[PDB]
Ligand binder design. Structure first.
Ligand SMILES: Nc1nc2ccccc2[nH]1
Ligand SMILES: Oc1ccc(Cl)cc1O
Ligand SMILES: Oc1ccc(Cl)cc1O
Lengths: 188, 185
């Protein structure tokens, strides 16, 4: 990940004007839509939190959790730490990132800071549900000037995405002011 | 460097009791001694600064500044960013690190933050002197409880090194309380 840390602008885009900041969300959304497309119900929820972190969750199968034979760490960690632009870029440029994977009846939890895992992926409990959730806090060391998520930029993009992805429910929630939207298109 | 960041204790030593914190200084000192031996004057100065950083300087030839043909960056950057455990470990676990190299009539400077270079090694001026200097600020995210450098732990190890490296002068300075020593065999 040090290649991304050396020149963040080359991977995420302009880190001053806010376009790079919002590209962080859309990169994670693309991964969530991919996971949502595999599965029948297909819902993603994008939440702008009061602390200016964003979470993106899907109810798909859950990203793989088994140990990668070569890398010697969970497949999830490989996805988060090995170089659209990839979720590993978002991880590298986030001062904190929380990963929650529900898969094979088990809840898996891992925490990252600036792309560095704080511990190995751990089974913390049990669950009837399946899916992946990433919540990330953009790095204030990288993202300057514009450091807050504008609702309208996300809302407009997710509406455009809904029409390309049939049967996928996309919910947008703003916990700062309670503003909500639900984009769901059934075409085909 | 992410392997070091992931398990700092395995490379530097215990990050809570102060062992790891002081090993950061000793790792830089090892490289300073090697450089000091290859020069004429053969002196190292270890300075504990008031803001809880440590600088280690030698008066040797200066570490190489030219572009590494494989890595495609300065040889100095390769030393600071590629895996004694190496100064790259110290760089990875320092919230800031300042590198200054005096070599071939020129002063070179570079700044790192958590092992990430902020710019390429750059020529900032001219000089007749030669040597290398690294000043590092230990990461308070990694190093907990014992965050401040105890003078006597450093003094003890530098004394041992002065006997083993008989030709090399070693000065220790503490800018917090003005305490100082000069170890030379
Ligand atoms: N604050 C901070 N910034 C970092 C960049 C890379 C790795 C660890 C870091 N901790
Ligand atoms: O829902 C998600 C699915 C996959 C990734 Cl990498 C991130 C997500 O947030
Ligand atoms: O004096 C020094 C010489 C070489 C290195 Cl890598 C670090 C120093 O501080």
């Amino acid at each position: 990940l040090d290649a991304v840390r050396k020149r963040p602008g080359m991977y995420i885009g302009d880190t001053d004007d806010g376009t790079g900041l919002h590209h962080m969300v859309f990169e994670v959304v693309d991964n969530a839509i991919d996971e949502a497309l595999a599965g029948h119900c297909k819902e993603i929820i994008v939440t702008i939190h009061a602390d200016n972190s964003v979470s993106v969750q899907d109810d798909g199968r859950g990203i793989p959790t088994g140990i990668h034979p070569e890398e010697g760490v969970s497949a999830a960690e490989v996805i988060m730490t090995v170089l659209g632009v990839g979720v590993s870029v978002v991880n590298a440029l986030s001062q904190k990132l929380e990963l929650v994977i529900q898969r094979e009846g088990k809840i898996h939890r891992q925490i990252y800071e600036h792309g560095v895992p704080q511990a190995p992926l751990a089974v913390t409990g049990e669950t009837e549900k399946t899916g992946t959730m990433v919540r990330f806090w953009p790095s204030l060391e990288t993202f300057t000037n514009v450091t807050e998520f504008e609702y309208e930029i996300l809302a407009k993009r997710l509406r455009e995405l809904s029409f390309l992805n049939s049967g996928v429910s996309i919910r947008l929630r703003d916990k700062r002011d309670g503003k909500e939207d639900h984009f769901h298109y059934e075409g085909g």
